[PDB]
Amino acid sequence: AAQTNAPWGLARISSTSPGTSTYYYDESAGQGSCVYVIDTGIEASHPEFEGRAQMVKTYYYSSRDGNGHGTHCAGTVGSRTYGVAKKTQLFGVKVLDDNGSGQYSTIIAGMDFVASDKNNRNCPKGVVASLSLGGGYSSSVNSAAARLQSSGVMVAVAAGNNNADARNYSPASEPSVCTVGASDRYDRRSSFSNYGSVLDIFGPGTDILSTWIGGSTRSISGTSMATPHVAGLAAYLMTLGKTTAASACRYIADTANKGDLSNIPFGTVNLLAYNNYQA
Ligand SMILES: [Ca+2]
Known part of the structure; x- marks a missing residue:
């Protein structure tokens, strides 16, 4: 399949060079897999989700996304127009309030929740959890991420936006999960992206068009x-x-585009996520 005039980040992950505008992908498109977006929630009624999104847990008065951040991240996972895996099932867990803030005890509870809840869901191709959140180092938050990964969920976490070594942030600094840095459309490390030996992979992070509330x-x-x-x-x-x-x-790292990024500090991987699709 080919999506023409795609957002640049989708094109970039299906190309060995920057500057293309077509997203090439296998038509299976993630069908049969499940992704938990642990964030401010998901506006499940957005037409771009096609009924494939639902809220399964909230830690606040409402399960609605009143912020937008979680809906944006969910859209990049699995919306029709803006998503990588256009047929995946999305489950929302609201651990952040509508200002985008949350206590570490709540974030930990949401991770332990997904480790259990996935046993109640029909996800024959597997389960992913996407955590676009973090704060200062906490061994308890790292441990919760490690448990979620150990339970059989692929955990991806943001490296953080401090232009600093991610070793000082959580859950970014947990080695067992997949810690993701940001790049821009010219293949530079994004100006705000954290770096360091704990990063596993880079993906597109500057000027990303997706769904909103x-x-x-x-x-x-x-x-x-x-x-x-x-x-x-x-x-x-x-x-x-x-x-x-x-x-x-590890598979994503092994099959990544290698050495293409600029402004990568010594000691940080130079690896950009790539789907290796050949028609
Ligand atoms: Ca790792």
Whole structure:
């Protein structure tokens, strides 16, 4: 399949060079896989989700996304127009309030929740969790991410937006999960992207067009936007049978475009997520 005039980040993950505008992908498109978006929620009624999204848990008064961030990230995972894995099933867990903030105890509870809830869901091709959130180092938050990964869920987390070593942030600094940095459309490390030896992979994160609340769309930037490209790519590769939840991060690294990025500090991987699709 080929989506013409695609958002640049989708084109980039299906090309060995920057500057293209077509997203090439296998028509299976992640069908049979499930991705939990643990964030401010998802506007499940947005036409772009085609009924494939639902809220399964909230830690606040409402399960609605009153912010937009979670709907944007969900759109990059699995919306029709803006998504990597266009037939995946999306489940929303609202651990952040409508200002985008949340306590670490709530975020940990949401991770433990997904580890259990996935046992109640029909996801024959596997389960992914996308965490576009973080804050300062916490061993308890790292441990919760490690548990979620160990339970059989491919965990992708944002590296953070401090232009700093991600070793000082959580859950970015948990080695067992897949920690994602951001790049821009010219193949530079995004100016805000964290870096460091704990990063596993880069994905597109500057000026990413996706779904927004009120049935709308907008372009925003962050390692929060790069993470769902990698989460959607994992769901897509698991559906194709190329890899499993345990090894997807390593498979994505091994099959990445290598050495293409600029402004990568010594000690940080120079690897950009790539779907290796050949028609
Ligand atoms: Ca890792």
